[PDB]
Amino acid sequence: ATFEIVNRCSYTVWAAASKGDAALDAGGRQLNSGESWTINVEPGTKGGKIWARTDCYFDDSGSGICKTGDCGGLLRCKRFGRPPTTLAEFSLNQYGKDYIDISNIKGFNVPMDFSPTTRGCRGVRCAADIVGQCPAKLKAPGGGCNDACTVFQTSEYCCTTGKCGPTEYSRFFKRLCPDAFSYVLDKPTTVTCPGSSNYRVTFCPTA
C-alpha cells in the first residue's frame, strides 16, 4: 500500500510511521512546509499509525527529541510516539478490506486529513483548532492537547477493564472533531476501504 504523507502546515513537522514494534518504511523524516513523503506499507499491516512530531532536533546519527510525538528520541521511529499526537490509524487487508480512522485517544498536536487516493471509500478529517480550544488541564507545555488518560492515569480515562464511558474531556475532542475517536469505547468512526487501497495523510489540510 502506498501512503503519501504531506505537510501542508506552515511549520516543519517530522513525520513518523510505525506499527508499535517496528518502523513502517523508513519510520520517520523531516517534512518542511509543502513537502511530501511517499512510503510503502506491507499489505496485511495491522495497527499501523502515522503522525506528525513538532519542534524536533536531531543530530547526524538520527538521535534527538521532539516536543510532541517523540518515539524514544529517534528520527526513524520504531515505536509509537509520546502524546499529544493526532493519529492516522490503519489496518490493511483485514478480511479483504482496509480500515482507517483518525484518533484523538492519544491527544492532538496537528490537524490532519486521512483519505484514500484510490476509489471506493471516503476520507476522515480532524482539522479543528483543538490546541487553541484545549481545556486548561489537558494543555501540554511542549505544545498540543493531551488526552485525559495521559494526564490523569485513571481507569475511566484509560479504559482499563474495557468499562468506561465518555467524559467531559472525551466530549471536548468529540465536539471539535466528530469524525475522530475521542475515547477508547467511542462509537467507531472507522472507514472501510477496498483492500490494498492507497492513501494520503495531510497535516494541516485547511492551512
d(CA 152, CA 68): 18
Q: Does domain 1-207 bear CATH number 3.20.20.80? A: no
Residue pair 123/191 in contact (Cβ under 8 Å)? The answer is yes
d(CA 71, CA 49): 12
Number of alpha carbons in the 13 Å side-chain half-sphere of residue 78: 6
d(CA 45, CA 88): 14
Query: What would the grid cell of residue 46 be?
Result: 495491522
* For residue 205, cis peptide bond before it (omega within 30 degrees of 0): no
For the chain, the domains span 1-207
User: What does this entry list as its resolution, in Å?
Assistant: 1.5
d(CA 112, CA 205): 6
* Structure determined by: X-ray
Query: What would the grid cell of residue 207 be?
Result: 492551512
